[PDB]
Amino acid sequence: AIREGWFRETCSLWPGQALSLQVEQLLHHRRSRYQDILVFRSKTYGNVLVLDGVIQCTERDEFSYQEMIANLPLCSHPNPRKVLIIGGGDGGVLREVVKHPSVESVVQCEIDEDVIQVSKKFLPGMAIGYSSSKLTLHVGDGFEFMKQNQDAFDVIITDSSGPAESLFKESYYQLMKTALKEDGVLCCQGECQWLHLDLIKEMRQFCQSLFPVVAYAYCTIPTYPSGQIGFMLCSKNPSTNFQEPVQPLTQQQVAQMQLKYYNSDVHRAAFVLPEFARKALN
Amino acid sequence: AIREGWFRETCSLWPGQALSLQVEQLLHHRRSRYQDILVFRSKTYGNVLVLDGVIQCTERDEFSYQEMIANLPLCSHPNPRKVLIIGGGDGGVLREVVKHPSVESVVQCEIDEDVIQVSKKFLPGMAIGYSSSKLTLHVGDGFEFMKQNQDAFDVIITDSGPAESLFKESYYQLMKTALKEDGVLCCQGECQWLHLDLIKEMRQFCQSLFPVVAYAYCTIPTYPSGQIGFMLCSKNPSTNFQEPVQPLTQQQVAQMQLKYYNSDVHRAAFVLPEFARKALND
Ligand SMILES: NCCCSC[C@H]1O[C@@H](n2cnc3c(N)ncnc32)[C@H](O)[C@@H]1O
Numbered sequence: 380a381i382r383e384g385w386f387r388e389t390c391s392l393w394p395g396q397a398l399s400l401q402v403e404q405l406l407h408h409r410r411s412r413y414q415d416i417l418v419f420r421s422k423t424y425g426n427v428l429v430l431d432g433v434i435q436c437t438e439r440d441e442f443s444y445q446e447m448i449a450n451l452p453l454c455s456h457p458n459p460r461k462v463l464i465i466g467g468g469d470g471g472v473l474r475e476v477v478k479h480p481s482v483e484s485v486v487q488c489e490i491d492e493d494v495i496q497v498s499k500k501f502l503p504g505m506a507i508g509y510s511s512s513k514l515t516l517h518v519g520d521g522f523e524f525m526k527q528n529q530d531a532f533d534v535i536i537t538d539s540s541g542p543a544e545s546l547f548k549e550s551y552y553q554l555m556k557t558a559l560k561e562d563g564v565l566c567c568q569g570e571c572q573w574l575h576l577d578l579i580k581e582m583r584q585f586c587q588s589l590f591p592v593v594a595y596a597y598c599t600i601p602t603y604p605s606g607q608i609g610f611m612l613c614s615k616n617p618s619t620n621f622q623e624p625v626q627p628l629t630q631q632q633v634a635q636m637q638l639k640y641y642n643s644d645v646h647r648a649a650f651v652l653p654e655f656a657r658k659a660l661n
Numbered sequence: 662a663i664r665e666g667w668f669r670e671t672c673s674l675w676p677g678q679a680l681s682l683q684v685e686q687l688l689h690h691r692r693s694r695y696q697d698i699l700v701f702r703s704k705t706y707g708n709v710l711v712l713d714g715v716i717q718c719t720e721r722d723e724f725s726y727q728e729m730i731a732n733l734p735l736c737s738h739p740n741p742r743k744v745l746i747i748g749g750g751d752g753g754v755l756r757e758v759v760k761h762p763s764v765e766s767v768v769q770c771e772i773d774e775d776v777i778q779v780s781k782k783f784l785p786g787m788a789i790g791y792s793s794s795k796l797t798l799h800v801g802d803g804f805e806f807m808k809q810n811q812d813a814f815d816v817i818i819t820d821s822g823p824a825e826s827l828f829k830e831s832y833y834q835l836m837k838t839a840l841k842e843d844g845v846l847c848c849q850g851e852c853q854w855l856h857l858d859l860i861k862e863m864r865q866f867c868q869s870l871f872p873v874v875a876y877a878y879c880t881i882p883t884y885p886s887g888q889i890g891f892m893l894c895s896k897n898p899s900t901n902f903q904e905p906v907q908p909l910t911q912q913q914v915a916q917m918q919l920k921y922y923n924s925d926v927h928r929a930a931f932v933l934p935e936f937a938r939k940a941l942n943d
């Protein structure tokens with residue numbers, strides 16, 4: 380678990396490498412119906428949330444992933460009013476989504492109530508999202524939830540992990556296409572281009588067969604394997620240009636929203652990939 | 662050093678975090694006049710070169726840093742013919758520099774002959790640089806070497822214990838002197854996730870010496886926090902580092918066998934997360 384003051388993250392999906400974070404205080408460690416939940420105060424990354432032994436967020440750097448996964452799709456849609464978030468138990472994505480004036484309603488489907496309880500206590504900076512009046516919280520498996528919906532959402536965001544398994548079925552993308560309005564867009568966690576370029580290539584070919592516009596973007600974040608993570612973006616609107624935001628933010632807006640990673644130039648740059656990845660996907 | 666099949670990298674300059682790489686075979690472990698030199702074959706990153714306990718390169722990901730530190734300055738200069746590299750014992754930067762037709766001569770000043778010998782054996786993919794006919798190899802401390810030169814180079818690259826002399830503030834002024842009247846330089850420039858404060862100071866200092874100063878970054882899994890930055894300065898007041906004066910065609914990128922760098926990557930590399938853009942520009 381914790382060895383000699385350090386928590387080390389290992390997983391077969393990134394063999395031969397590992398991030399360790401020095402620990403100041405074990406805060407919590409319980410098994411819910413669904414996953415092993417471990418929280419600690421780290422020496423230099425604030426509070427750290429670990430699920431089934433994978434670091435899922437830290438207070439120091441969560442703002443990059445949270446802001447990008449929210450703003451990439453929202454600023455690529457002309458008028459996002461109804462939004463669905465799958466997963467995102469910590470509240471952080473919700474936090475970022477509700478900052479948009481155009482958004483009237485956000486539905487969140489999270490499978491584990493306990494993650495919600497732990498975050499409210501140990502990740503208050505993220506869990507502040509739950510105080511939004513736009514929230515309709517739904518407990519349950521997002522896969523099954525998606526079948527309940529048709530032509531319902533402008534934007535869907537999947538903020539996944541285990542239990543996230545149902546979310547890696549190939550019909551999930553088709554279920555999402557169905558749940559989306561006619562010009563809806565979606566954003567899912569999309570693999571690290573330094574770790575699983577092969578999988579990004581497959582996922583992209585599959586999505587392109589379902590959607591007229593498909594794109595891949597990435598952001599940096601020290602505490603995810605290899606220091607970065609990617610996003611899969613799909614649109615049912617054939618005129619969507621993910622690379623150039625249809626809703627550019629002014630500096631006033633960026634300041635008002637208190638963004639610390641995202642802005643309109645970051646948006647554009649996020650789609651500019653290293654040659655090896657650009658070649659593979661294009 | 663190696664514990665239970667894993668090498669862990671710790672340093673006070675990134676407290677509370679650590680990358681470990683799983684080890685398949687210890688290949689080499691000797692102290693030169695200058696530094697502790699450790700090479701191993703890792704399970705998933707190829708051969709790994711460690712100097713004084715800091716990972717300095719791996720075969721799997723060295724191409725990003727090597728290509729960017731070389732091409733960032735070279736493609737920002739209209740006609741780079743004489744080039745100086747400080748450090749770069751492994752040969753990798755030299756490898757990338759000599760691919761440029763305009764470059765007639767490359768001088769390299771490396772302080773430790775042993776690093777050169779180890780790389781030739783254990784990093785052949787990098788050390789192939791030494792086979793170039795354009796190379797003038799010089800052994801010695803780059804700080805003292807810089808004093809020997811005036812109005813001599815179009816481009817200087819610093820690929821940096823013993824690197825201490827290279828962190829004295831007069832080094833930048835020494836470099837300005839050694840450069841031709843429109844020369845440019847590129848130095849390793851700190852991680853914006855780790856030492857934003859230091860990047861801000863360095864930039865204010867350089868701006869007081871050069872009419873054009875810029876900061877760029879690239880990703881690389883095995884450097885702390887998964888990325889590293891570059892400080893760029895030009896004595897040419899019309900230099901625009903953000904838009905390459907020498908754009909590469911797709912043919913060229915293919916001919917040069919680049920795996921990270923291209924002209925769009927060049928431009929995107931200067932697009933920083935909002936927190937860093939704010940700190941360097943407000
Ligand atoms: N914020 C950074 C990373 C997100 S952590 C992954 C989150 O998604 C939830 N989750 C996992 N599988 C799920 C499923 N099938 N349906 C709904 N929620 C799920 C899980 O409970 C956790 O809250």
Ligand SMILES: NCCCSC[C@H]1O[C@@H](n2cnc3c(N)ncnc32)[C@H](O)[C@@H]1O
Nearest residue numbers: 748749750771772773802803821823824
């Ligand atoms: N390629 C990725 C990282 C480069 S590793 C740093 C390299 O710079 C050399 N070096 C260190 N201090 C030096 C100095 N003062 N003068 C010249 N060379 C030096 C050192 O011997 C090593 O080869």
